[PDB]
Every structure is written in C-alpha cells, then in structure tokens.
Amino acid sequence: NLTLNFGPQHPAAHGVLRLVMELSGEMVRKCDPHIGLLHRGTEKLIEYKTYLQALPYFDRLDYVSMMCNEQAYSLAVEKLLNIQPPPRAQWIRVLFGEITRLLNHIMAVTTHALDIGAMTPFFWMFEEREKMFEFYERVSGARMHAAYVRPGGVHQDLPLGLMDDIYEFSKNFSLRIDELEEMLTNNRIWRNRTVDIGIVTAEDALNYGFSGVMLRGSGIQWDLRKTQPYDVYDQVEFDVPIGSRGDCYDRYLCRVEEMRQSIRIISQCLNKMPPGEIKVDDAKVSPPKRAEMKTSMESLIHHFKLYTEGYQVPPGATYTAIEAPKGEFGVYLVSDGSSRPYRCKIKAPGFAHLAGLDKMSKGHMLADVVAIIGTQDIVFGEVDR
Amino acid sequence: ITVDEKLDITTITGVPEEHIKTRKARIFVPARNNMQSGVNNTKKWKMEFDTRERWENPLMGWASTADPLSNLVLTFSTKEDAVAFAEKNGWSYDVEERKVPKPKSKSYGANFSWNKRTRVSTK
Amino acid sequence: TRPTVRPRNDVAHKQLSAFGEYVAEILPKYVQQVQVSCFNELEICIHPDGVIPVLTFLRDHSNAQFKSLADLTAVDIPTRQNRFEIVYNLLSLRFNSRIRVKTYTDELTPIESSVPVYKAANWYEREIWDMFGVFFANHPDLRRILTDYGFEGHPFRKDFPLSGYVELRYDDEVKRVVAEPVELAQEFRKFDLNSPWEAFPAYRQPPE
Amino acid sequence: TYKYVNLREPSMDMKSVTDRAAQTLLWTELIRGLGMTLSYLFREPATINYPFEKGPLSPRFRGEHALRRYPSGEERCIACKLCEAVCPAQAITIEAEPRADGSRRTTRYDIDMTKCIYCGFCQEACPVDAIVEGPNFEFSTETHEELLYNKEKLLNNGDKWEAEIAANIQADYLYR
Amino acid sequence: TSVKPIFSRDMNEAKRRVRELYRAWYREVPNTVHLFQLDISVKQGRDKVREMFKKNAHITDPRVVDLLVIKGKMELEETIKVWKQRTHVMRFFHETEAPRPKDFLSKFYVGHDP
Amino acid sequence: KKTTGLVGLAVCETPHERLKILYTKILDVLGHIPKNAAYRKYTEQITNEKLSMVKAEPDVKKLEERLQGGQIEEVILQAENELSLARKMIQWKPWEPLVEEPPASQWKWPI
Amino acid sequence: IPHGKGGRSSVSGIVATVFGATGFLGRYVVNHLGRMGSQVIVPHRCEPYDTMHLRPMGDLGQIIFMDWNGRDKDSIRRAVEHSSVVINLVGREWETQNFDFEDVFVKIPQAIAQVSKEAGVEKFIHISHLNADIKSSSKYLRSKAVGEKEVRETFPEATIIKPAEIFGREDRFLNYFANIRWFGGVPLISLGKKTVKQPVYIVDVTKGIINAIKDPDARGKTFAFVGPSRYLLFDLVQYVFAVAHRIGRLFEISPFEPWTTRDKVERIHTTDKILPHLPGLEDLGVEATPLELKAIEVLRRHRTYR
Amino acid sequence: YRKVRFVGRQKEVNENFAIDLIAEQPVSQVGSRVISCDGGGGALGHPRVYINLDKETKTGTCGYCGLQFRQ
Ligand SMILES: NC(=O)c1ccc[n+]([C@@H]2O[C@H](COP(=O)([O-])OP(=O)(O)OC[C@H]3O[C@@H](n4cnc5c(N)ncnc54)[C@H](OP(=O)(O)O)[C@@H]3O)[C@@H](O)[C@H]2O)c1
Ligand code: SF4
Ligand code: SF4
Ligand SMILES: [Zn+2]
C-alpha cells in the first residue's frame, strides 16, 4: 500500500501536521498523524516565572483568542485568592469575552473554505475584520497579543468612545453574515461537498472526551455557558444551537447561529453597564494608581515590592475550565505558596479533537481528509498542552 | 501478584551524558541573609552544584557561559530524604549540618544594678 | 465580611461532603484518603491496585454517570520517597460535578492503564511515558509524541536543567546539521525572591 | 435552551416539487444567488497606498524604545532596576555606579530588541517614568549584530523626537 | 522489593531479550546504509551496534535492563520505517565534534579544570 | 416521534417491559453476591425504588418524570451498563478491607 | 588569551585574516575557524552576494567583511593592522582579458609582503604547489616557482605550505573528469604513463593549517603535503566511468570559462613526486585519508542507487 | 584591540552629555526650612521629597530632582 505523507506540503491551509496514510488503494482505513512541530518548552518554562510575569504566555497559546485566553487564567487564580472582581470589571470581560467568538467563528469558516478552495469568502470577510482590531489597539496595547486581563481584574478603563463605536459596528454586521448564507447554505455543491462526512454520533463521541461543537450540534445538549457561571453572564438571554445529525454539515450550522447569538449579547450587554472602578481595592493584588504612587508613603512600598516579587498565594490544588470558542480549557494550576507557581498543566482542545480523527476518517476518500480537519478548527501551537 | 521481593541499591543512569562522575553536589541550610531578621527561609534543605568558569562575551561583556547545569535548586523536606535523593540517581555529594542558636537567657530588670556590672546607661 | 471577597456557599459544600462519604463506605479496599476542598472539590486518594475498577465503578452507575474524561496530567514531587503523582480529572455529565483521582506511584513500578475503561486516554497516557518514563501497562501502542527523536532525558522532571545539552547548529563541512554541546549567550540570571516572615497563619507547619 | 436547525421535512406534493425540479434542471439557483453576490464588484476598493497613505493608530500604541529626560538635560532614569526585574525576556541589563557628582546613574544599558517580547511592563514599572515605548515602527536593519541597542542609541533615539512622545503621555496619563 | 516487574522475572527472560533484537539490528545495518543514502562503510555500523550494548553491562538488577528493552525496541520503530530524515542516524556519530583531550598534561594548558 | 433526540440511538422498541425485564434481570444476579458490603444495600435500594415507579403505568412521557434519566430509550443505557457493572463485582473483591496503606507521610501537601 | 570550551562563542586568542576565500579551498578552511571561535577578518574583492553562504559558520561578531582590490596598498593594509597571524591563498587559473596574470603571483604576494609584515604580524603562511618548478613547463605551472623564490626574499621565515593536488567536493581537477560527457572519453593523452599525482583529501588540508596556526616554531620550516597510497595509476580514469556508470559568472552565461585547449591540459600531467625530506604533513599531524572511501560522495550521476 | 569592528562604520556616538549639565542651572533659593520638589510638573517626574537646607546653603539636588537646590 502506498504510504504518502501529504502534510509537510505547504499546500495553503497551514503547512504543518505531517502524518502518514496507509491507504488501501483509494480508501484510507489507517491514519496515524505526527505532532510536535511546535513543542516550544512551555510547561517547563513557567516554573521559573512569577504570576504577573508569566501571564502573556497564556495569551500566545492560541492564534486567535486574546481575551478568552487570560480569561481562563485570572479566573483560575482569583478563586485561590478569595477575591470577587469589582462589578464594572465583569461587564468588560463578558464584552471582550463575547467579541473573540466573533474572531474564531469568522476564521473557522473562511480558512475551512480555503482548504476547500474557495477564494472570495476569504477576502470578503477579513476586510470587515479590520474594523475590529482598531478596538484592540485602542484599549490595550497592540495589534493582537495583549496582556490586558490581570488577576486584579481589568488593567485600565477603556477611553472615551468605544460605545458609539461598538453600537456602530454591531448594527451593520448581520448583513455581512447574510452574505455567506447566500454563499454557502443555499448552494448545492458545497452541500454536496459536505454531507454525511464524519458521522460520529455514538457514546464514543463522548468517551473520546470531546468538548463543544463536535458535540451538542451532534446531539447531546450540554454546554458550559449556562450550567456554570463565570461573571455577570447568566443575566443575559440567548439560546444555544443544536444541529440534526452527527456530521460536519450539522456541526457547521452551529457556527452560523452562534454568530447570531453574539450580536444579541453585545446588544444586551451595553444597556446594563454601571459606572464604577476598575481594579480590586485592597491593593495587595492590584497596583495602586499612578497619581498615588508619587505622593504617599504607603503607595510605594505596596508598589515597589509588588513588582520585585508577586503576590502571596495560599497552597492547595485547584482546577477550572471555561468556554474557549472551540472547546473547554482545562488549567490544573498547582500552587505552592510563594511568588513563583509550581506545575501549571494545561488541557487544550485538539488532544481529544484530533486523536478521534482515527475513528472519523476511515471508510472514506483521501480528498475527504483535508475537508475533515477544517471542521474541528484545529490550531497548532495550541496542541502544545 | 508476581511480587518477587529482591534487593538492589537503585542507581539509575543513561539519562544524563557524562556528568555523573564529574561533579559533586552539596546539601546545606540557607541561613539568614543578615540585612534583616526574618527566619522563614530556614526549615528547607536545598542543593547547588559545582561552579565553573564565567568568561566575557566579547561583544557586550555579557556573562555567557558553558557549565550547562549551574542553576538547579530543589526544595527538600529534611535530612532523611536528603541523602536518599543523591544516592537514588547516584553522584557524589557532601553534607553540611543545621545550626540552631542558643535559646537564650535574656531578662530585662537586671540592667539596673546595685553592685553588678550589667548596667546600661545613656538610653 | 465585605464586598470584593468571594461569597462562598454551603449547599455544594454539603452535598459534596455527603456524596463522597459513602464512596469509601462501599469500596474500603482501595480508598485510603478522601478530602473535601473548601471550594467544592473532592479528592479520592487511591493506592494504584484499584486503578482500573474504581474508574470502572465510576464508569457506570445509576447515581453517578461520570463518563467525561477531561484531564490526565502528571505532577512530580521530589522528597516524597515515591516521587511522581498521576492525577485524573473526570466529569459527571448529568450532575455538573467535578472530582479528581489522585494515585501515587513510583518510577519503575508500572501502572495498569485505563485503555479498555476509557478511549480518550489514547494520546494522554503516552505523554507521561515520553516526559517521565512512567511505563503504563498493556497499552496497544507506546511511542514518542511531543518530543524530538534523539532525546534521552524525559525532561519534565526536576533534574533536567532548563536548557538541554543539545544546542543545534549547521556547518557546511559536508551537508549535515550536527549536534553540539550547549552554549548560551547569557546566563539566564536566576533571582532570589522568597521574602521571609510567613504571610500565612492557617497552613502553619507542625513546629517539630 | 434549544434550537433545531436544519431540521425540516420536505413538502412532497404536486406543485412544490416543480420548485425543486426547476432548481436542478434549469439552474434558477446558483446564478440568481451566486452570480449576483459576486457582482457586487462596483464597490470602492479599500486599499491603503502604504508609502504614501497610512492607517489609523491609538495613543497607547507600543513600539520602539526610547529614554526621556527632564528640562534641560538630566537623565530622568535613576537606575532603580525595576524595569529589569519585570522584563519577561530579561532583555534589560544594567550596571550602575556612583558618578563623581554623587547621584547614581548608569554605565551599561541594554535592550535585547531580538529577545524583547513587548510586554511593555517597563513603561508601567518605572516610578520616575523613565523608559517609554515610543510609537514609531521604523525598523529592519540588515544584521543581527546591530539590533542590540546600547545606551548611546537610546538617548539619541529618545532625542530624535520628544514632542511625538510628550503629547501621547500627556493625553493618556489620567487613565493610568 | 515490593514492586512488580515489567516483562522479565530474574535475569534469564532478561539476557535472552538483549541477544534477541541484536540480530534485528544486525540485518538492519546493511539494510539502511543503502536506504538513507549516506556513505560510510557498513562494518563501522556493526561496530557501533555492539558498542552500545557492551557499555551498559554493569547492571546486576532486573527491570532496569527491561526498561532499556522498551527503549531498545522503540528505536527500531523509526528505524525500519523512514522517520529519521538523514540526520538522526548521523547523530549517533560524534563526527564534526572536536576531540576531548582526556589527558592530564593536555587538560592543564587549556581550561579551568572542566 | 421517529428521532430519539440524542442521535446514535433508535427507539427499539417497547417501553415498560424491556425495562421491567432488565431491572429484574439485575435483582436475580444481585442475590448472588455475599451480603457484607453495602453495595447491595444501596443498589437494591434504588432499583426497587425505580422498578416500583416503572411497573407499570402510562404513558411513556409520564415515566420520564420521577425517573431522572434522558429519554426512555436512554434510561435503558442507564441500567444497561449497570448489569455489566454488578456482574464484575463478583470477580474482584471490594468488600475485602484496605490494602497497601501509604508510608505514613505522603498526603501532606506543603512539601 | 583563551577562555572555556571552544565549542562556540569562545575567544581562543587568535585573530586571523584570510584573503581570497570564495573558492573551493578558502571557504572550507574558514569553516573551521568560526567553530573554535576567533576574530576572523575576511575581506572580499567585488562580491556582496557571493559570501552569503559563508556567514552561518561564525556565530556572532566573529566575522567581518571589507573591500579591497590588491593593486591598491592601503586596502591591503587598513584591514591587517590589527591582527596576529595572516595566511594567503589567493590566485586562480587562466589569464584575464584585463589583467596581467604574471605579477599576480609575484607582486600580489609582495603587496602583502609590504608594511603588512612590518606592522608586527607573525606566522605568515603562503601556499605553494608540489609541481611548481623553475623548469620550462609550464606558462602557469612555472611562474609559480618564481614567486616561491623572488618573494621568499621578504618574510625570511614563513613556513609556506606546499600542497599536492587536492580532491574534495567542488574542485576543478577531479570535476574535470566526469564533466566530459562527449562523443569520446580520452585520457591525457591516451597513455597511462605518468598518472597520477598525489590527491590529498580536503579535510587534511584544513587540518594542517589549524595545527600550524599555533604550532609553535613553524616559521621558515616549509612543509609538503603527502597524498594517498601511494603514487596512483591509470585506473583512476577507468574508476570514474565505472562507479559513475558512464558564483558570479554573469546573468545568462560567461563567454569564456572554458576547458582551455592551452597549457591547462599539461599542468596536471607533469606529476613530479618531489623531495621526501620535507617533514611536512605527517609531522604536522595527523592526516591519513584513502581515496576509495571518499569517492562515493563527490561523484554524482544518473543512477544514484545501484 | 577592539578597534577593527567599525572600519567603514563611522561609530555612531552620542553628542550631548548629562555627566555635567546640572552645573549650568540657576541654583534655586528660598530662605525657608523645608521645600517640596515635584519638579518637572505635578504627577510626573520625580516624587515628592522634603529637604533640609541649613548647612553650606544647599540641598544636594535631592538625588531625584537633579536640579541644584539651595538658599
Ligand atoms: N591546492 C591545489 O590543488 C590547487 C589547485 C589549483 C589551484 N590552486 C591555487 O591555490 C589556491 C586555491 O584556490 P581555490 O581552489 O579555492 O579556487 P579559486 O576560485 O581560485 O579561489 C582562490 C580565490 O582567489 C580569488 N582571486 C583570483 N584572482 C584574484 C585577484 N586578482 N584578486 C583577488 N582575488 C582573486 C578568486 O576569486 P575572487 O576574486 O572573487 O575572490 C578566489 O576566490 C589558488 O590560489 C589556486 O590558484 C591550488
Ligand atoms: S526605567 Fe526605572 S528601572 Fe529602568 S533604568 Fe529607568 S529608573 Fe531604572
Ligand atoms: S519592552 Fe517588554 S520585553 Fe522589553 S523590558 Fe519592557 S516588558 Fe520586558
Ligand atoms: Zn525636585
């Protein structure tokens, strides 16, 4: 049998993920991919840093999420430190935490529609995506990778503006999602390109430990978005999509309705924000203000020491996970009792979502296999967990 | 079950390259950076290996170096498992001893005497 | 006490004190310590003789579904006289409850793996072999994932230093990309950060 | 809650099949839809002519390093080493010394612009507000041997401009 | 030792296993030398095979040798197939590395006793 | 209905007696275990609790209430595996006492 | 003064200067000099792109590039004013359409026998050839021995190295064979009389320099390069077609980089196994390389497997 | 020794120096006891610090402030 390794080929998509194919003439029936192109030494590296200093290495763990990562870290630290965050701060973590889902669910369709080979829905949506990075630069520090969420809540307040901008932005977005509905849904060939492909629906679709979509849209109703709270996140109203059967085209149609939920939540979140503060007030965790660290005596000693070493975290293990826009996000943060943490093991999606490519692939073509991968939305560097 | 009780001193090898027989470890107590007087940084045995050369990197003057280990300190619990870790991987070492001070006898009131010498002034 | 302090609750602290109690009652063969976390988490310390059946007991029931294997991790702890610590984390689907399984072991002593019990441990179980050398029993395919082909280190333990020994370079001496002993441009200056004076009253050690 | 999408049984009668028969046979689909949504070509191309035109920014945008000083030159840096201890890449290296006047200053001052991961914490750690991430992306030399910035780049680079820097701090220091 | 072994019991299921895969390496050394398109002599490969087995012969304890068996067998998984693209097999030979002195007068002129 | 909600199963076929065999299928195997472990004390408790509400009342939809599983065909799977659970309770012996107590200081966290 | 391991990023004391260093010989020598670590100062003639493949041998700050002609003086003086040792290997084959080609082996080694020597250098080493004799053969082979004596007046102690014919990867002499895909493969010249010379292997060439660069005491005592065992035969030309189974030129092509039906064809068929009283290679040890093992590498033709 | 790395590289060097530029300042005077130094402006520059000026009429540039302060 021919043993071609169609992978390292820089054939668009993402020139990585080099695997083997022991194809039985035309059908595959055996797929054993290799990973480890970026191992980077991540989990060993954090063992020498402090809590505030290690924080951007959670940010660079995806390619896409900037505020959904570091959402799974501060909320994994504030439980250890007996802190609730202040109420103005929680309305921003839901706002940017429900704006990164309008970055994955744009990239999760276009990049899938580029491996397939369509050109024009790649350029028709990233030109609208530019209207959104101006937000990131205006609020935090940079284009994408922002050390913005801290353990002491939000870093700083978003400036004057950004409320007649987001309302200006979000009132003209549903026309753009009505474009791709005409581009892909009512079309037949793309429907014929993906129906009854990847029919994985049994209880081994959950014994493989999958997280969301490539879940509930295939069947079993469950999510971490209204059975487990984060912040002020249950006080808004929305629904969660479910597809019919257990193929890719009934996990594709989650993502059209999923983007039709984030517009509602943003248009529901803006009406409910109170004026208030930014940081936690007790200042053993938050740094004091700049106009304060130049006047009093108490401000500097709880400033100058708070950057030489970090916080004082109590011992005892902990664990949590939140909704990453492609899955769960496990962090088993072992604390020791000093400024420097102990072991920090992460669970990212793709461990389950790509080990189950063995079950999902066989009985099918070779041209099916590239169409499988862009449905799970697998990003490397994120499989470094 | 297949218990097969047997006895051997566990010396494991093959995982490093050559630095088993080359180096010698050191087990000691860190004892009170004496710019201040906090005694929390006692109670834990530590280790540190041999120190080798630090030259000048002739473009900046940085402390570039060989000596690939040079920074490995672990946190031990006591003297008992201090030895048992150095033998389980099996390279040479040398052990210090814990120093605890005098208790000691200090009492105010004897600083004002009728005939003694213990007498303070100029306070 | 005030705002900006996490409001704890007692309802989940009650049932998780209730549920896990009669778990040790109905298998006093493998369970050696159960503890309740002060924020609604549970540990069931298990000697690894019962690595398969206790999972197999939590694999199925009518009062405990627990069929969502989320997290297999591995934590090393030197100065314990049995180093390593395999820790699971599993999820009840129907009940919204988290519970972890802490099973210690040592290096050379193997562990009966969870291959028939769960099929999400296909790539997780191999990872501990590549990173520590903990040889699980009866796995159908043990291989090398997430490391390079020539390492001999199992790096995620503590004796492996920060850099390796294997700083790689190219020469045009013939064609090859050859290995070499490691050479840095900078020390990685190691600080000293542990302040004294014991900020924590509750976790105070036995003073001996 | 729920929603059951793509869950709809067909019509299956006499007349509505003629809507599904004219679709496949004469292609009233795929041209009314996909030949009109492409054209849609008459819109204006939103392209920036980069060597002439430039895009928007923010007043808190990061970039090139620089050092400031007081009115008539004083070296605002006080060498309090705090930017060093929070640099995640340890791109800072400072050796200080008592200068003969008496006040302490610097001797070596380094930013590994290769290693520099741009966490910007140096800008938010100096008490006397010395180092500033200057907003100019002018870069791209030709050697690795050049981007290691010594001190006499940075004071010069902090003095190619100041009115660019001094207006952005003065419009943003009230927030932080 | 209150610990169960891996494969062997005591030294005799062990020492027949290290002899076993030696033949699998021995027919492999002429097999790969024309496959990976590298150019040395084939007897050097057979010398380096027995170089590796003989060096670790100072073991008087089971399940460590058995631990090296799992290490020794996993080497063949990449080896019989093509998973080491012309570099990892060349990594066995410290070829372009400068020679260590290993002599006392020779160490003394160069180095702060490395 | 023709789809059972949870995709991957089929309504196959009859409620109210496919269950009623399988509860009683367990209870006969339940008597085989020597009674010193409390495994019998709770498992026979909930099956008699279940089968009393199972046998035998209309409708299918009413049997969903007061029996907290998924749909009724999936409630088979709630006890399908439980039959496979209790028969292996004879094979290994959890009613035996504790074995291999840890060496007296291991589950102490701060090193 | 030296420091630590000389694996990479060391100092090792020495500061050399290698001219030419764009051909087959001068590149491969420096690729050892950036391994032990030193200030290698290589000035190139007129080629910014043709040194691009050279740079990833010296780590960082170890190499440096300058421009020089050679008929100018200070460009050969400004660079060499801070060094310790200096070798030279400059020269080539056939006369240029613009140059003079005689004094290039006379005044150009003299142009760096200028104030260069006076500046304070030591262990200056030039290259020779084993066959460069004062006899009336050839136009290129002789007029190389003229530089061996008329420039030997300057630098009274040098240890000028004398190599034999070399074989490596991309030389001219061994690649003169098997680049002869033609309507006839003729040897030189249909006779097995004098073939062959001593093909020393290229690792032995670069190893002889680095032992001599702090030997010590190797100045004036000139050295010769032993070849393989032992003379060689006519079989070499048959050895080519048996196992082979029968850089700044221009934008399209160079008009004249020929096979040169001139005194090129005789400069190799003039063997001259010269005097064995030179020490010259085994004493500058250790160099011992056969031919039969390194022949698989350089030859590359259409079969590639069998 | 190091003088070869910049040949044809012109040695881009600083021009002004703050080694001595304090000394050209009109050294301030008050005739009081203790003075604030929020120099460079409020909420920027060096923090507030109080100096005794009784003894060879000076303060000592406060370290932080840098400007020569006296009476
Ligand atoms: N050991 C042997 O068997 C053997 C065989 C044949 C020849 N040689 C001679 O020994 C040395 C080996 O050279 P090679 O094998 O590496 O080939 P090569 O290409 O001739 O290398 C020698 C360098 O000298 C340069 N050069 C020629 N004329 C020059 C001039 N007027 N000014 C400055 N540079 C000039 C050449 O090109 P650039 O100008 O671009 O730098 C070349 O880079 C040469 O001198 C050669 O004549 C030796
Ligand atoms: S920015 Fe602050 S820490 Fe850095 S050199 Fe200046 S004064 Fe020192
Ligand atoms: S700019 Fe970034 S990398 Fe550089 S010192 Fe500041 S925080 Fe560290
Ligand atoms: Zn002042």
Domains and CATH numbers, chain A: 19-376 (1.10.645.10)
CA A193 to chain centre: 27
Q: Which two tokens stand for residue G84?
A: 């310790």
Chain C CB contacts of G60 below 8 Å: 185
Please tell me whether the peptide bond between D3 and the residue prior to it is cis, using omega within 30 degrees of 0. no
Q: Which residues of B touch E112 (CB under 8 A)?
A: 52-53
Give residue A270's identity as a one-letter amino acid code.
L
DSSP A274: P
Q: Do chains H and A touch (3 or more CB pairs under 8 A)?
A: yes
State which residue of chain A sits closest to F9, comparing Cα positions. Answer: A202
Distances (CA, A) of F4 to A253, D9, F11, F73, G85: 20, 16, 6, 8, 88
Question: B53: distance to nearest CA of chain E, Å?
Answer: 7
Measured CA angle at C151 (ends C145, C156), to 5 deg? 70
Nearest to B99 by CA among B25, B31, B26: B31
The one-letter amino acid code at G7 reads G
CB-hemisphere CA count at 13 Å for G186? 7
Q: For residues A113 and C187, give the distance between their C-alpha atoms in angstroms, rounded to a whole number.
A: 47
User: Under an 8 A CB cutoff, do H43 and A294 touch?
Assistant: yes
Tokens found for residue A189: 């060939």
Q: How far is CA G84 from CA D92, E19, G214, in A?
A: 35, 57, 11
Query: Residues near E86 by Cβ (< 8 Å), separated by ≥ 6?
Result: E36, E37, E38
CB A346 within 8 A of CB A45: no
Cβ D121 under 6 angstroms from ligand 3 = yes
- Cα of B69 to nearest chain F Cα, Å: 24
Nearest to A241 by CA among A221, A267, A224, A268: A221
Write out the H or E segment, with its range, that includes residue C11. Answer: helix C11-19
Phi and psi torsions of A357, nearest 5°: -75, -25
CA distances from D159 to C48, D162, E75, H11 (A): 67, 6, 60, 18
Q: Would you state the structure tokens that stand for residue D169, as one six-digit string?
A: 């701090």
What token pair was written down for A162?
């950004």
Atom index in ligand 2 nearest the CA of residue D92 equals 4
CA separation for the pair G9, G61 (Å, rounded) = 10
- Pocket residue to mutate for ligand 1, from G17, G19, G24, G25, most atoms within 8 A of Cβ: G25
What long-range pairs does B10-18 form, CB within 8 A, spacing at least 24? B10/B88, B10/C108, B10/E61, B11/B87, B11/B88, B11/B89, B11/B90, B12/B88, B12/B89, B12/B90, B12/C107, B12/E64, B13/B90, B13/E56, B14/C152, B14/E56, B14/E68, B15/C152, B15/C153, B15/C154, B16/C153, B17/C165
**C-alpha pair distances (Å), A56 with each of A119, C191, D118, D121:** 34, 20, 10, 11
- CB C69, CB C116: distance < 8 Å: no
Contact E40, E33 (CB under 8 A): yes
Question: DSSP label at A242?
Answer: B
Strand partners, C97: C92
Residue G57 DSSP class = T
Tokens 């079969």 sit at which residue? G303
Query: What three-state secondary structure class fits G44?
Result: strand
Distances A315 to A318, B75, C204 between C-alpha atoms, Å: 9, 15, 11
Residue B5: count other Cβ atoms within 10 Å of its Cβ.
7
- Bridge partners, residue H52, by sequence: H34
- Report the alpha-carbon distance of residue G85 to residue G122 in Å, rounded: 5
Name the DSSP letter for residue A11: -
DSSP assignment, residue A287?
P
Residues of G in contact with C171 (CB under 8 A): 31, 35, 57
* Whole-angstrom distance, CA of residue A121 vs CA of residue A176: 11
Tally of residues, chain C: 208
Asked if G76 has any chain H CB less than 8 Å from its own CB, the reply is: no
Q: Are A18 and A8 in contact (CB under 8 A)?
A: yes
User: CB-side exposure of A126: number of CA atoms within 13 Å?
Assistant: 12
Closest by CA position to C44, among listed C28, C24, C59, C61: C24
CA pair distance E114, E110, nearest whole angstrom = 9
Look up residue G50 and give its two tokens: 């043709």
D122 is in an annotated binding site: yes
Q: How far is CA A172 from the centre of its chain?
A: 24
DSSP sequence for F26-87? HHHHHTTS-TTSTHHHHHHHHHHHHHHHHTT-S-HHHHHTTS-SSSHHHHHHHHHHHHHHHG
Q: Please say whether the dihedral angle defined by the alpha carbons of residues G213, G215, G216 and G219, taken in this order, is positive or negative.
A: negative
How far is the C-alpha of A384 from the C-alpha of C1, rounded, in Å?
42
Burial zone of D83 (CB within 10 Å; 0-12 exposed, 13-18 middle, 19+ buried): buried
Tell the burial category of C192 from Cβ atoms under 10 Å away from its Cβ (0-12, 13-18, 19+). exposed
Q: Which helix (H) or strand (E) holds D92?
A: strand D92-98
Q: Which of A109, A81, A72 is nearest to A385 (CA)?
A: A72
Chain G residues within 8 A of B22 when measuring between CB atoms: none
- The residues with which C89 forms a beta bridge, in sequence order, are C71, C100
Cα dihedral G45/G49/G52/G58 (nearest 10)? 30
Using an 8 Å Cβ cutoff, are B94 and B26 in contact? yes
Torsion angles phi and psi, residue A121, rounded to 5: -80, 0
Question: Are C164 and C179 within 8 A, CB to CB?
Answer: no
Any E CB within 8 A of G2 CB: yes
In chain D, breaks (C-N over 2.5 A) are found after none
Of the candidates D4, D61, D82, which has its C-beta nearest A244's C-beta? D4
Question: Between F18-30 and F39-54, two packed helices, what is the crossing angle to 10 degrees?
Answer: 160
Q: In terms of C-beta distances under 8 Å and separation of at least 24 residues, what long-range contacts does F50-57 make, across chains too?
A: F50/C62, F50/F23, F50/F79, F51/F19, F51/F20, F51/F23, F51/F24, F54/F16, F54/F19, F54/F20, F54/F23, F55/F16, F55/F20, F56/F16, F56/F17, F56/F20
D103 and H25 within 8 Å at the Cβ level: the answer is no
**Rounded distance, CA C50 to CA C166, Å?**
41
Q: Are C133 and C77 in contact (CB under 8 A)?
A: no
Question: Which positions ≥6 away from B12 have C-beta within 8 Å?
Answer: B88, B89, B90, C107, E64
Q: Where are the domains of chain G?
A: 1-306
Question: What CA–CA distance (Å, rounded) separates A167 from A160?
Answer: 14
- In angstroms, how far apart are the furthest CA atoms of chain C? 73
Q: Does residue H37 contact residue H49 with C-beta atoms inside 8 Å?
A: yes
CB C113 within 8 A of CB C69: no
**Residue G120, SS3?**
coil
- E89 neighbors E32 (Cβ within 8 angstroms): yes
Residues in chain E: 114
Which chain A residues in 258-297 lie under 8 Å from chain D, judged by CB atoms? 289-290, 293-294
Q: Which atom of ligand 2 is nearest to the CA of D106?
A: 5
G248 within 8 A of G47, measured Cβ to Cβ: yes
Contact (CB, 8 A) for A307 and D86:
yes
Nearest ligand to the CA atom of D92 = 3
Interchain pair H45, D173: CB under 8 A: no
Measured at the CA of C173, the angle between CA C167 and CA C176, to 5 degrees, comes to: 55
**Interchain CB distance below 8 Å, D88 and A138:** no
Radius of gyration, CA atoms only, chain B: 24
Segment (H or E) for H52: strand H51-52
Q: Is residue G206 in contact with ligand 1, taking CB distance under 6 Å?
A: no
Distance CA E42, CA C147 (A): 30
CA distance D3 to A238: 11
Distance CA D68, CA D66 (A): 7
Residue A200, φ and ψ in degrees, nearest 5: -125, 110
Atom of ligand 1 nearest to the CA of G24: 16
- Residue spans of the domains in chain E: they are 1-114
Q: Which residues of B touch G61 (CB under 8 A)?
A: 58-59
Q: Tell me if G90 CB under 6 Å of ligand 1.
A: yes
Report strand pairing: C42-46 vs C31-36.
antiparallel
Q: How many CB atoms lie within 10 A of CB G4?
A: 23
| Alpha-carbon distances, residue G233 vs A50, B40, G178 (angstroms) | 72, 83, 17
Integer Cα distance of F46 and F30 in angstroms: 12
H contact test, residue of G11, G17, G39 with most H CBs within 10 A = G39
Here the tokens at position C180 are: 């070499």
DSSP code for C131: H
C-alpha span between C125 and C75 (Å, rounded)? 13
Q: Summarize the annotated binding site of A as residue ranges.
A: 248, 254, 269
Let me know: does G211 contact G285? Beta carbons within 8 Å: yes
**Residue of G9, H6, B57 lying closest to D143 (CA atoms):** H6
Sign of CA dihedral C95, C96, C99, C100: positive
Q: Which chain D residues are closer than 8 Å to H20 by Cβ? A: 101
H59 burial (CB, 10 Å; 0-12 / 13-18 / 19+) is buried
Q: How many residues does chain D have?
A: 176
Which ligand ends up closest to the CA of H35?
4
Structure tokens, A208:
């493989």
* Residue in the structure block whose two tokens are 């609750």: C9
Q: Which two tokens stand for residue C48?
A: 């690894």
Interchain CB contact of A179 with D (< 8 Å): yes
Calpha distance C61→C84 (Å, rounded)? 31
b/e map A285-320, b = 16+ CB within 10 Å: bbbbbbebbbeeeebbeebeebbebbbebebbbbbb
Q: Across the interface, do E114 and G36 touch by the CB < 8 Å criterion?
A: no
- Chains touching chain E through at least 3 C-beta pairs below 8 angstroms are B, C, G
Task: Name the H helices within chain G.
Answer: 24-33, 107-111, 115-118, 145-150, 173-176, 202-212, 235-243, 295-298
Q: CA B21, B22, B23, B24 torsion: positive or negative? A: positive
Using DSSP, state whether G146 is helix, strand or coil: helix
DSSP strands (E only) in chain G: 40-44, 63-67, 161-162, 166-167, 200-201, 223-224
Does residue G130 line the site of ligand 1, with CB under 6 A? Answer: no
Nearest alpha carbon, ligand 2 atom 6 = D77
Q: State the Cα–Cα distance between residues G305 and A22, nearest whole angstrom.
A: 25
Best residue among D70, D131, D150 to mutate for probing ligand 2, ranked by most atoms within 8 Å of CB: D131
Give the method of determination.
cryo-EM
Rounded distance between C-alpha atoms, residue G152 and residue G113, angstroms:
9
Distance CA G152, CA G124 (A): 12
Contacting residues for G304 by C-beta, under 8 A, at least 6 apart? none
Exposed e or buried b per residue across G10-35, where buried means at least 16 C-beta atoms within 10 angstroms of its C-beta: bbbebbbbbbbbbbebbbbbbbbbbb
Alpha-carbon distance F47 to C146, whole Å? 47
Helix (H, G, I), strand (E, B) or coil at A184: helix
What's the rounded Cα separation, in Å, for the pair B26 and B93? 5
Torsions phi, psi of A17, nearest 5? 50, 75
- D64-175: what CATH class? alpha beta
